Amino acid sequence: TLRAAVFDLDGVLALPAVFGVLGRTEEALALPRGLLNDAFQKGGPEGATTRLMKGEITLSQWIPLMEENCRKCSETAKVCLPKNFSIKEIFDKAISARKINRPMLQAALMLRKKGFTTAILTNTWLDDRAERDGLAQLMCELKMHFDFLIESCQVGMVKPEPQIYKFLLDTLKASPSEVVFLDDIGANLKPARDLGMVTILVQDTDTALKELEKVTGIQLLNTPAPLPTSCNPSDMSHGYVTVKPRVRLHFVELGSGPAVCLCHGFPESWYSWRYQIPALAQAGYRVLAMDMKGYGESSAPPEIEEYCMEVLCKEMVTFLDKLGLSQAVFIGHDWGGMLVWYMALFYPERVRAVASLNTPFIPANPNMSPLESIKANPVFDYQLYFQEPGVAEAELEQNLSRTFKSLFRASDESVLSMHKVCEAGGLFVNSPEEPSLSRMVTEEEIQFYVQQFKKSGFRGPLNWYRNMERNWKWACKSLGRKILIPALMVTAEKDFVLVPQMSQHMEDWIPHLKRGHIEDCGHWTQMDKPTEVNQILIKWLDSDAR
Amino acid sequence: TLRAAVFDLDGVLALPAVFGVLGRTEEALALPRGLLNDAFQKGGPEGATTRLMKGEITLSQWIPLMEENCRKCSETAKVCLPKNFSIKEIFDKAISARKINRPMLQAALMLRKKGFTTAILTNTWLDDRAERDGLAQLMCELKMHFDFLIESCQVGMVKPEPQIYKFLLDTLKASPSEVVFLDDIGANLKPARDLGMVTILVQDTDTALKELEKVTGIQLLNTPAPLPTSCNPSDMSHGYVTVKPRVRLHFVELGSGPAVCLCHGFPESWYSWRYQIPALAQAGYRVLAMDMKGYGESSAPPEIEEYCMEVLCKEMVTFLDKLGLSQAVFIGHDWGGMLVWYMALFYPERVRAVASLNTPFIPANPNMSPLESIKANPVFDYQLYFQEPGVAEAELEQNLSRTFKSLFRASDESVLSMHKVCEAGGLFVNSPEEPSLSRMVTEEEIQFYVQQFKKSGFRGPLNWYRNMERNWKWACKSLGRKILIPALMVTAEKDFVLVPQMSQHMEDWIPHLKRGHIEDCGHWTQMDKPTEVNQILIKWLDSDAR
């Protein structure tokens, strides 16, 4: 019974094989066949390449030794190497061209999801080249998906030496018959085969996955499109900034590059961005996913006025100040989307670019009280129910698991009537006590929200809705302005409250506005359609937040 | 009795005045005198510029209105504006050229140090230009040094309107006679003068500071060179990463740009880098100042083997992995310096560049046990005293204030004999029970270290010295390597343990090594000579960590 899968890197998890360039270079330069592959393997276990792979020397020290081997081979073959011959240039280009073998990575992800222990076992080097970051980035993207990474240069052992296989088995805490081992080099397969491991010689990926599927009894080929990588809260870097004596803001941080500040809505968490954080960080951004004021590990003062937009925006400016950031891209959803438009209006110098999911930008009407304006739209009745301090807190805090399971549903899973909420007497009046789990969330994800809301409950979050008059007076000061910094509005076809139609006049105030639109998407955009959200945001960031 | 100082921005804290370009542009383009300064002030309180300064419109909306005013003025004056005339280009260049008036900022810093409440009061705009970041950076660098920043566009009021002065006084919680108000515009001085505030018309900085010195009775001109900006722990962003089940690492984080990981020595803190963190972040780097394993808010497991260099380095690689960083520049001092050389040797792909303060790189001698090697140098006797578990812990933990005050001293303040420490029976045997405060530290700084060491004490920190044999065996695997990534070695003339001479052969192993050297500098480099450390590191980072 197999319970562990081991993959090689070159030619298996990453393609084209860096090894493959030697044959290509020979052909392109009309050199005798196998000359470069000979200089490379020269001296076998005692040679320069084995010393490199065991970590005795670095890649930069290996380059002149490989150069020396190339001549010795050329001299024997009675051929002259071309004038401008460069081993450094050949290897720089080969390493740079090598990319993750996405269907192979998908198969490894599926096996791990099914309970398999997975590992990468590779003959690799200590890379000190000026361009080493490209390879460091590839190794980082890949290794996060595996239980173990065993590199020859770190362990002082190489394949096909028998000791590295015993080392692999000791690491896996598994007997050989429990291991599938995948490799593109026949010679490197034999010792694993000799120990009784299941072995797969990898030439083309489809056949290798067919053999892997047949031997494990798990569907790996032709599978449905997987979800983007999520976040495990315990594996994240957690940051904490005091913005004023009684208020601290918590955030999760991942990646390098331009700062991207993600701002969740009601009643959410930094974790509502779980599918976006790894994707945006891998796309070359430094993601700061906030617990907004009133939520999770951030402070939750009880006063209603602590949650007016002016105060919330001022604190987000202080947050940037304390972190030493002159700007960040601000991306918001729901109440977070309203905050990001106001950050763009009041602090354009601190906003690199702005994007909202679902929340439109509608200028305040100075001739209508916000109380009057909310009353006009029947879908906003729940906002009237949220006004009286304590009423909605009591209902939302009674049973947390029920609250989150009732709220977080796809457009075809509704359990609530967002209609005549006050008259009905609550959001959950004709709602099940034990709602079924939505296709959008796991029980584990629901329990994370439950755990977060046990600290402060719903007072602070509900207070975001209790500053209508104050927010209206503040917003009226901005009526003569336009948003002229880069902006993106993302509508969700099936959000029945923040309907796409509400965004129809935004170009009057944001003339250069860019758009995205997601079909068959409800209110909970990030978790409803994470793949599409990621595609839209990454495309926009790369073109406009540059 | 004055207790508050208020400074204008344009022409006072920042020069050349953005206003000053109008006169310059007129002269350069041979336009009639004062034409551009007329189009700018056109319509007075009802005009486009006052609307901009009150925050009614943004700078990008103001540009075509100023353009319209420029023509109306030119038409009246019977002159034609040059063909390629651009208000945007003129203002972009003027804003970009404006820099902090360093002696004015120094005076404000000195007044605050002496107990004054300080503020910036400025007529400014909402900047939505594509180049707005330059100004955001300037405002960030400046505002951190003041109690208040009052911007006309945020308060909807402008100087010389009387309400902004009453608003300033309300903000300062001071009566007018308690306020010195500095401005370069005569008209903007009068309302403050009318209320009874002390006013300084600023033309040239020296005269303005002479008037300021005379009126406050505090020396501001000709003062000694100030120390670099320090860190207030409560104002920093604090980060926490779990690198393994029982181990979390704490760090302070400031700035944007390439990641720079600062690694302190024994028995220190992230706070040992307090003078470097603001300087490096302002120089365009993202600083991550660590609490090393065993210290401060980082985990401190009791096992000796948790502190061998192999384990410590592996955890720092995991730290980068969890933060989503493919590389960081690694800068170390003392034990932190030893760690950074080993990061360069074992993980060059993760090290953008490496720098050490005081700690040299000396390859392990495979023919001498580390016990034998340490014995040879009498200055390393204290390391032998640290070997026996519990002995040095008891002495160092007996009185924390005494420990830190005895250790942290400049080269001419020695209170300890680092000689025959074991034979003597401890580091503090012939040491005062109440050492005098060193010129290097405040009582407040000593108490921060005391507070940090109350959590875990000295077991984990001392364990860094208890892995000699293990570190030697690991280091021997790297003997065939060279450090070929960018490297900087900084020696300190008066470090009597890590003497500059010990670094003399480093070029044999690091051929491209760059150097720095600090005269009259003891062991505690960062706090002994912070200005020189900052100058050396910033110069090197800008040329080599690019």
Ligand SMILES: Nc1nonc1-c1ccccc1
């Ligand atoms: N309460 C309101 N009426 O109009 N616009 C608002 C508003 C303004 C800013 C933030 C949130 C809401």
Ligand SMILES: Nc1nonc1-c1ccccc1
């Ligand atoms: N303990 C030792 N002998 O030589 N070199 C070392 C060493 C190696 C790595 C880190 C710290 C010390």
